[PDB]
Amino acid sequence: CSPGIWQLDCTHLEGKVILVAVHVASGYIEAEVIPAETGQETAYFLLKLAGRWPVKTIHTDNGSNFTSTTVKAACWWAGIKQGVVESMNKELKKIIGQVRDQAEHLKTAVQMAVFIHNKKRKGYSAGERIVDIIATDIQ
Amino acid sequence: CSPGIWQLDCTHLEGKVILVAVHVASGYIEAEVIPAETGQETAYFLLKLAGRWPVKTIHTDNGSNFTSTTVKAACWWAGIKQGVVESMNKELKKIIGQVRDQAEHLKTAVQMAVFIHNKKRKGYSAGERIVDIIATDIQ
Ligand SMILES: Cc1nc2c(ccn2Cc2ccc(F)c(F)c2)c(-c2ccc3c(c2C)CCCO3)c1[C@H](OC(C)(C)C)C(=O)O
Ligand SMILES: Cc1nc2c(ccn2Cc2ccc(F)c(F)c2)c(-c2ccc3c(c2C)CCCO3)c1[C@H](OC(C)(C)C)C(=O)O
């Protein structure tokens, strides 16, 4: 849909938390392994994300994720308001499992899975589609 | 110059290390605050960066930064080889100083400075130029 929409959710693996951001229009992913599911971690992740892409609106499958004072502060400062996402998360979880034995740390496997996901042609890749969608929206 | 060239360097502030990546052709920046200047931190940062952008070659002002087994492993797996950068780092350091009192954590000020830097029109911004350069290179 719109090029400024991102969906953010956390998933749990090996007793750790993976924050996954999906650019809904392209299927492109950004992810980080965080110690715990806290408002401060979500707020910091949003500031990083908003500095890289033109983030207009955020969606989530857990609304209570965005109630903290810290998350509201990050969205205020950055000027952020509010099958694809389910499929992109499914694909990422599958890829982590496929590459997991190749690294010691879960965070390393997660970044290998993000790379594989973003570079896979579906014909363009999610990495190619996001830059095309954003560049076209500017011009 | 070429759209796949990035320059990576560390800078020191308040007893912490900031890893700064500059996309040479656009002036776009990605940065993270790391505990210490280690090969494992550089390797992990490179895996994240390479998953987001088409990273072909890496430059640095300190060649010894890339000698560790971990950095060479990240470049091998991701298929990475090897006034603008000086100006982009100068501007970032100036912006951190300007916004520093607005946040408790240096990492928060750093991400606010990256956002401000990438969104500032110079007429396009570094954030707009990187997506235009990469989208044009694909098509
Ligand atoms: C933790 C870690 N160590 C690594 C390496 C590579 C060498 N070493 C040293 C080493 C030496 C002897 C060993 F017996 C041993 F098991 C590992 C990667 C690493 C770095 C980059 C990378 C990959 C690996 C495995 C896999 C493909 C994608 O890119 C690691 C790695 O951790 C950091 C990325 C944090 C450095 C990991 O989680 O295994
Ligand atoms: C650590 C931190 N705490 C924050 C907040 C916001 C509210 N609080 C709670 C709070 C309550 C009462 C206070 F007296 C007090 F000082 C702070 C930001 C924060 C979050 C987002 C953000 C900004 C701030 C200050 C500045 C503009 C860009 O976006 C922080 C913040 O740390 C995290 C980003 C890790 C949450 C910080 O470093 O100050």
Side-chain angles (χ1 to χ4, degrees), chain A residues 100 102-109 112, chain B residues 39-41 43-45 47 69-78:
Chain A
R100 190 63 192 86
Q102 300 175 46
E104 176 185 347
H105 306 297
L106 171 62
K107 64 175 197 180
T108 306
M112 288 167 74
Chain B
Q40 295 200 5
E41 292 296 337
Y44 185 65
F45 183 97
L47 288 176
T69 294
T70 60
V71 172
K72 292 167 170 177
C75 293
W76 165 77
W77 191 83

Side-chain angles (χ1 to χ4, degrees), chain A residues 32 44 48 51-52 111 118, chain B residues 32 44 48 51 111 118:
Chain A
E32 290 271 5
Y44 185 65
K48 289 196 286 180
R52 312 197 213 289
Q111 302 308 339
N118 286 340
Chain B
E32 290 271 5
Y44 185 65
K48 289 196 286 180
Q111 302 308 339
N118 286 340

Side-chain angles (χ1 to χ4, degrees), chain A residues 40 43-44 47 69-70 73-74 76-77, chain B residues 102-105 107-108 112:
Chain A
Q40 295 200 5
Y44 185 65
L47 288 176
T69 294
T70 60
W76 165 77
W77 191 83
Chain B
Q102 300 175 46
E104 176 185 347
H105 306 297
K107 64 175 197 180
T108 306
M112 288 167 74

